[model samples]
Target: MKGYNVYANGIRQHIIHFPGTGSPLLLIPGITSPAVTWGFVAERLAKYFDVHVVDVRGRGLSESGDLDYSLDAMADDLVALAQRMEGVVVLGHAMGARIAIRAARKDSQVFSRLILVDPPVSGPGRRPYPAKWSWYAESIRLAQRGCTAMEMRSYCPTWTDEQIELRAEWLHTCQYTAVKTAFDGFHTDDIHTDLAQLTLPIQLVVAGGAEVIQPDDIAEIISLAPQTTTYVVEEAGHMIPWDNLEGFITAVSNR
Candidate 1:
């Protein structure tokens, strides 16, 4: 993968590019996921399309100096990357999924399709995200101390051994303030409205169970956009790629 940084949305955003044959595919990682960790997935996905894995601001090489972590700002960053890549198909996981939805809402002209994977449906008066704030907080602190894979295993019980080792090494790069703000935004920002208004075709890749996007949330999504195709990877929870890579790839390979 070819890695580089660019001035985007007033920040030096980083992207790791894996060139391929067909359409351009922009892959956005979760809240704490640095671009490097997603390289495994990007390498495989690259066989089908050109894949660019992003280091969302405040993580890995895309270090941010700004204070705002609102979905508005995050979405704009996504738009900047998409525009820089010359309009692409977006595939995002968890918080990144939320960002993709908001970005697509802002500029439908820049995206042909969106593949949102297990985005949080939590909001005001709704159940909180299954994983608590302390999980990220304590893990970040541990990683700063140069934590081991065995230590990270407790936080990510579902992750593979390789995933655990990589995360233990890179989790420290995740900015504390940015993660906290984005976690807060999970409940404050509304993506339901954005889903209803998208002008292009879209796909929703959900994990089984009520961890992230619950059954009612799926129902709500369908009610909003009846044309949307939602796929459920039963073996995974909110972290689909880690729990089930084959399932995740099968669900998204068509894109």
Candidate 2:
């Protein structure tokens, strides 16, 4: 596991390289998370693939700014990164999953396959959150203030010291504008729009214990993007790769 910085869109993008001699595999992390989220899974896949994990623009070790943080903009950034490598098999979680889908729309062939881990894709007739405005409001506030190691630990009680430090250092260095920009470009309808255009082999990895994306939730996503195949990791939460290494590695390998 080695880290390097790549300059793109005037912001330094942080990446973790898990060296291998085979095909390339890119992993993108979700909101408030870092490249390390894929640490466990990447370490295992390194034996068979060249694993490259990215820290999405604003968060983690990546450069922070007040640029375009919409799905389209973020997608463009990842697309640029993808072009630098050979064909890639891209995997993304949560917000990153949404961004990955958008990137696929711009250039479908950049990635040989797509993997959406707990994505937010509900069909036209459904509203993403009919009564969950408070959650979004709180997240907006948190992003503005940033967090410390203690605050991160408070949010995720199960995190180890290393995890806490990584998140804390990231949060401390993050720019509030970048966080706000990403959130500002966010919309529930983005998922519906992206799913309509995405037509690739998408593997949906649902966390059985996560309230965010359960088996039933995964089914809804698959319904919207019918190209997807679904599977549930029984012991995992929203943090699948971090919480269930064996399950995540095996599922990704099979894909």
The candidate that achieves the highest TM-score relative to the unseen native structure: 1
lDDT of 2 by residue, 1-255 (tens): 999999875668899999988799888877666687567667888888898999888767786655666677788888888888777988888778878888998888878888888765443455342224444345445644765667667655786777666665554444556545544444433665667678878887877776666456566666777878877888687778667778877777755
Error of 2 at 212 (Å): 1.9
RMSD of each: 1.4, 3.4
- How far residue 60's Cα lies from its native spot in candidate 2, in Å, is 3.3
Clashing pairs in 2: none
Residue-level lDDT of model 1, residues 1-255, one tens digit each, is 899888888888889999898789999889999999998888889989899899998899886666577889889999987886665999989999999999999988888788989988876777677778899999999998898999999998878899999999999999888899989989888888888888687799999853787788899989987778899998576777777788888998974
Candidate 1's C-alpha runs over 4 A off are: none
Q: Give the worst 10-residue stretch by lDDT in candidate 1.
A: 235-244
State, as a TM-score between 0 and 1, how close model 2 is to the true structure. 0.82
Best candidate, lDDT: 1
Worst 10 residues of 2 by lDDT: 127-136
lDDT of 2: 0.72
